[PDB]
């Protein structure tokens, strides 16, 4: 097994606040400054005490870092009751606070403290009065995330969920580069933090995200009518009267020599990168269109309900198989690009092609050929297809892993 546990940003804050207030009884600083101190020493309570007396605190603290008037931010007048302030005596209406704080806790330029909104001054707003002045628990969560990020980075058994508005942490017994699952649903690699990437190792994915950091439409090979891609499937049938021929979108060669021993377009130094990156990026783009299939299938599963919810389950499963396979596929192109060609690589490439074809067939049935088919026939067809897609995917991963157990793979 690989056991782990999910905690909320609420819980992971209580953890920190307790870790603060065990230092904070010794050093008697305010709760918010101790946090910034402890953050600076990477939550080593010792290398904090071996500086919080050793040196002059000034160098330490430097290393770490009119009443009946209108509001000076919005210019409207209110009763003095509504004007909150900080320790500087700068006061502002309780809404401008909420608007300032809120827009300050959105990404571009956030560190881990917010200062007073006055011109000039930079007296920090203490953690606890940020929570008190902002309202919506969506924003509040983000703040908690930001002040706790240091605490969670400095701890090697906690990682954040990568999902953008989920602020939960997975907690483990050891780090391993196995897959963990958030409880918003998101499944990620605990070691590297990216999305789960079964065949490729985390190192080679890091290298492939930096190198990849720096065509939406294309023309029919036969009739040259501009085809925008609408759906993730790559078995392209040409929407025309003149030419109703079929062609693989990536290589633009023909279908159906695809899915045979003879023709393989998945097998191939910047000319090379463009080949493998094209297929990765394509499969990624495809995966997005793949997600929007929970709509289209429930329209057919709803139409099958009226002619119920039991059947609707198999089509969801089908789309969930398809998404997982595409995802693997995506990443097999990362793994291959870095691969020194050897005795096992040929067998891998065949499995990659088997999975690629077995995906396109499932992907293209749910996108086109299901509606050109009767109702009693599609339960069997779809099931037989995703069960096969799943085997080819499982065969592929089984193969690389054998190789990894014996260092078969070179780079």
């Amino acid at each position: 097994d690989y056991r782990y546990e999910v905690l909320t940003a609420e819980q992971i804050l209580q953890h920190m606040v307790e870790c603060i207030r065990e230092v904070n009884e010794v050093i008697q600083n305010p709760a918010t400054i101790t946090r910034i101190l402890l953050s600076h020493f990477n939550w080593d309570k010792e290398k904090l005490m071996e500086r919080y007396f050793d040196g002059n605190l000034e160098k330490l603290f430097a290393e770490c870092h009119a009443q009946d008037m209108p509001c000076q931010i919005c210019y409207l007048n209110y009763p003095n009751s509504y004007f909150t302030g900080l320790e500087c005596g700068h006061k502002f209406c309780m809404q401008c606070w909420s608007e300032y704080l809120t827009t300050k806790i959105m990404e571009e330029g956030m560190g881990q403290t917010i200062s007073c909104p006055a011109h000039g001054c930079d007296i920090l707003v203490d953690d606890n009065t940020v929570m008190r002045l902002i309202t919506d628990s969506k924003v509040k969560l983000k703040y908690q995330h930001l002040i706790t990020n240091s605490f969670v980075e400095c701890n090697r058994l906690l990682k954040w969920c990568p999902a953008p508005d989920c602020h939960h942490v997975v907690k483990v017994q050891y780090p391993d580069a196995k897959p963990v699952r958030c409880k918003c649903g998101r499944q990620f690699c605990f070691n590297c933090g990216e999305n789960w990437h079964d065949p490729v190792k985390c190192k080679w994915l890091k290298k492939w995200i930096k190198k990849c950091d720096d065509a939406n439409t294309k023309e029919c090979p036969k009739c040259h009518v501009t085809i925008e891609k609408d759906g993730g499937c790559n078995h392209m049938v040409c929407r025309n009267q003149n030419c109703k021929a079929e062609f693989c979108w990536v290589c633009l060669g023909p279908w159906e020599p695809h899915g045979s021993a003879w023709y393989n377009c998945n097998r191939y130094a910047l000319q090379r990168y463009l080949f493998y990156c094209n297929r990765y990026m394509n499969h990624m783009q495809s995966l997005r269109f793949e997600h929007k299939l929970y709509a289209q299938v429930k329209q057919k599963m709803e139409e099958m309900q009226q002619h119920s919810w039991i059947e609707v389950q198999f089509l969801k499963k089908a789309v969930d198989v398809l998404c997982q396979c595409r995802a693997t596929l995506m990443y097999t192109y990362v793994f291959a690009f870095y691969l020194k060609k050897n005795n096992q690589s040929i067998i891998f490439e065949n499995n990659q092609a088997d999975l690629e074809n077995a995906t396109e067939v499932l992907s293209g049935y749910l996108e086109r050929d299901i509606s050109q088919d009767s109702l009693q026939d599609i339960k069997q067809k779809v099931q037989d297809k995703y069960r096969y897609c799943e085997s080819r995917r499982r065969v592929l991963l089984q193969h690389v892993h054998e190789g990894y157990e014996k260092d078969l793979w070179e780079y």
Partner: protein, 152 residues
């Protein structure tokens, strides 16, 4: 987007009523109010032989996000690139305070015009010219100012 216009309305009312000598010729689209224009008139050489067109652009989220000043007149200054963007520190997203007034923002732009800060520039080569050989730079910027300036 509306509350911005409401604030700029009051700001713009206080400007045209008290005046800005160094910042003249203020044109704002009254429908919008989020996009002013005007002509800076510096007092120090190497720019006192001309004036410069700036366009201010207030976001919807003003005053909780800062505006963005871009010069339309070309200028020879270490802190303003060729496309017109100015690196004014008080306006950057890190330092911006929603209680900072537009009048202060602009006075601060004329600080920068009248005393170029080569320490954190946009034109790094112009910054070298300014420090390492003042007299020559002041002359280069003067003739650029005379060639591309505006009548006072």
């Amino acid at each position: 987007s509306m509350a911005a216009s409401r604030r700029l309305m009051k700001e713009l009312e206080e400007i045209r009523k008290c005046g800005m000598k160094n910042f003249r010729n203020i044109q704002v689209d009254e429908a919008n109010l989020l996009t002013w224009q005007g002509l800076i008139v510096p007092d120090n050489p190497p720019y006192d032989k001309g004036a410069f067109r700036i366009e201010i652009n207030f976001p919807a989220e003003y005053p909780f996000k800062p505006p963005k000043i871009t010069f339309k007149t070309k200028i020879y200054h270490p802190n303003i690139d060729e496309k017109g963007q100015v690196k004014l520190p008080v306006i950057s997203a890190e330092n911006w305070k929603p209680a900072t007034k537009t009048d202060q923002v602009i006075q601060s732009l004329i600080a920068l015009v009248n005393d170029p800060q080569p320490e954190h520039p946009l034109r790094a080569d112009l910054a070298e010219e300014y420090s390492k050989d003042r007299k020559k730079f002041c002359k280069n910027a003067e003739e650029f100012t005379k060639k591309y300036g505006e009548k006072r």
